[PDB]
Amino acid sequence: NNLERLAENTGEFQEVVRAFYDTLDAARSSIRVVRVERVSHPLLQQQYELYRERLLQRCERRPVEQVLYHGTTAPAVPDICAHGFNRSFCGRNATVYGKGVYFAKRASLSVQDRYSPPNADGHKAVFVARVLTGDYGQGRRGLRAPPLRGPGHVLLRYDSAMDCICQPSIFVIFHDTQALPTHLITCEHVP
Amino acid sequence: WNNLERLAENTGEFQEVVRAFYDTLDAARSSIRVVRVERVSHPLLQQQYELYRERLLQRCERRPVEQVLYHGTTAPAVPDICAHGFNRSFCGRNATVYGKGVYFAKRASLSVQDRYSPPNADGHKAVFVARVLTGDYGQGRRGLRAPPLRGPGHVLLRYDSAMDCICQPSIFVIFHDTQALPTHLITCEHVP
Ligand SMILES: NC(=O)c1cccc(N)c1
Ligand SMILES: NC(=O)c1cccc(N)c1
Ligand code: NA
Ligand code: NA
Numbered sequence: 113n114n115l116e117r118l119a120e121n122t123g124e125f126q127e128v129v130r131a132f133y134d135t136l137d138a139a140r141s142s143i144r145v146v147r148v149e150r151v152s153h154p155l156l157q158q159q160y161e162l163y164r165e166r167l168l169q170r171c172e173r174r175p176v177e178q179v180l181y182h183g184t185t186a187p188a189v190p191d192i193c194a195h196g197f198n199r200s201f202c203g204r205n206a207t208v209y210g211k212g213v214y215f216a217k218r219a220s221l222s223v224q225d226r227y228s229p230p231n232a233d234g235h236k237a238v239f240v241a242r243v244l245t246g247d248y249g250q251g252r253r254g255l256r257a258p259p260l261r262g263p264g265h266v267l268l269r270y271d272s273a274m275d276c277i278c279q280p281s282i283f284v285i286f287h288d289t290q291a292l293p294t295h296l297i298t299c300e301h302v303p
Numbered sequence: 304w305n306n307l308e309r310l311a312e313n314t315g316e317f318q319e320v321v322r323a324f325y326d327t328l329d330a331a332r333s334s335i336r337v338v339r340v341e342r343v344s345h346p347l348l349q350q351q352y353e354l355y356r357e358r359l360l361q362r363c364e365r366r367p368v369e370q371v372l373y374h375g376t377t378a379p380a381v382p383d384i385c386a387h388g389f390n391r392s393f394c395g396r397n398a399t400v401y402g403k404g405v406y407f408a409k410r411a412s413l414s415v416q417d418r419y420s421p422p423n424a425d426g427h428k429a430v431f432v433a434r435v436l437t438g439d440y441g442q443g444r445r446g447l448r449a450p451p452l453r454g455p456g457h458v459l460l461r462y463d464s465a466m467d468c469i470c471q472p473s474i475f476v477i478f479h480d481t482q483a484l485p486t487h488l489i490t491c492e493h494v495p
Contacts, residue, residue, distance in 0.1 A: 155354065155355065155358050158354055159351045159354055159355070159481060162347060162350050162351055162354070163347065163351070166346075166347045191449070194460070195449070195479070198479075198480075199391070199392070200403065200448035200449060200478060201448070201449075211392070212392065256391075256392050256393075257383065257387075257392055257393055266304045267304075267386070268382055268383070268386055269383075269386070269387075286390070286392045286393070287387070287390075287480060288479060288480050288481070289351060289480070289481060
C-alpha cells in the first residue's frame with residue numbers, strides 16, 4: 113500500500129498534528145486525531161516537483177507553494193492515494209469559486225462534516241497537501257478553469273483560484289499534478 | 304512564451320503529419336483541406352508525460368503503451384489545450400458514452416466530424432494530434448470517472464484507459480491530464 117501509519121512518537125507526527133490543531137479554531141475542542149498516515153506516490157511526487165520547479169522559475173512572487181487541507185469521504189481516500197486529487201474523485205458540490213478541487217488554509221473548514229463526513233466508526237478523513245497555488249486569481253462561480261488574467265499579462269489564466277484577495281482561505285486547483293497529498297489525518301468528533 | 308509554431312509545407316515534419324492525417328481520413332479524404340499545421344510545445348507537460356511513459360514501459364509487458372491519436376475540438380478550447388494539455392476542465396467537454404474523460408480517435412475520420420471539430424466563423428476546424436499513453440485498456444462505460452475495474456485475475460485495480468471495444472479499438476478515453484501530449488495542431492476545412 114501507499115499509506116504508512118506514523119508513530120505518535122515522531123517529529124513528523126507531531127508537526128502534522130500541531131499545524132492541524134493550530135488551525136482548528138472553533139472546532140479544536142471537539143475533534144480528536146485517531147491516526148496520521150504518510151502518503152507515498154513516487155510518480156505523482158516527481159511530476160509535482162517538475163511543476164514546482166517550473167513555477168519557481170516562472171513566478172516572481174513567493175510563496176508558490178502552500179500546505180493546505182482537503183476533507184473528503186471514506187470511499188475517495190484510496191483513489192486520492194492512488195491517483196492524487198482530481199474532480200472525478202473529490203467532492204463536486206462546491207462551484208462558487210470554480211469547478212475544481214477545493215483546498216483550505218485552515219483545518220477548521222475541512223473538518224466540517226459536509227466535507228469530511230464520518231464513516232461507520234465516526235472516522236473523518238482530512239488530507240494534508242503541498243499545493244502549487246502559484247499566482248491565484250479571484251474565483252468565479254461555475255468556471256471550468258482558473259480565471260482569466262486579462263490584458264496586463266502574457267499568460268491566459270491564473271494558476272489557481274481563491275475565495276478573496278483579502279486573507280485568502282480557500283484555493284481551487286484544476287490540474288491533477290498541482291497538489292501532492294503528503295499525509296492523511298483520520299480524526300473524529302469528541303464532546 | 305509562445306506555445307504554437309507554424310510549420311512550412313515543404314518540410315519533412317509537415318508532410319509526415321499530413322500523410323498520417325489523410326491516411327486515416329477515409330471517406331473524408333476528398334473533402335478535407337489542410338489550412339495550416341502547427342507544432343505544439345509544452346516543456347513541462349512533455350517532461351511529466353515522459354515520466355509517466357517511463358513508468359508505464361517498466362510496468363507493462365504488452366506493447367504499444369503509447370499511440371498517436373486525434374482529438375477534434377472547438378476554436379475557443381485551442382489556446383487552453385496548448386497552454387494546459389487535455390482536460391475535461393481546459394478541453395471542451397468530451398462525450399460521455401465510455402466514461403467521463405478525454406476522448407481520442409485512432410482515425411482522423413472520426414475527429415474531423417463537425418460534431419467534434421466544429422468550424423469557426425472562417426470555416427476552419429481544429430484537430431490536435433497527440434501522443435497518448437493508452438497502456439492497458441478496458442471497455443469503457445457511461446458514468447465511469449476512471450478507467451474500468453480489471454476484476455478478478457489481476458493485481459491492479461483499474462485499467463490505464465478505456466476504449467470503445469476490446470476488438471479493434473477506435474476510441475480511447477483517458478482520465479489523467481499527463482497521459483496525453485499534444486504534439487501538433489491541424490487546422491483544416493471542408494471543401495465544396
Ligand atoms: N474539501 C475541503 O476540505 C474543502 C476545502 C475548502 C472549501 C471547500 N468547499 C471544501
Ligand atoms: N474530440 C474528439 O476528437 C473525439 C474523438 C472520439 C470520440 C469523441 N467523442 C470525441
Ligand atoms: Na492574458
Ligand atoms: Na483487480
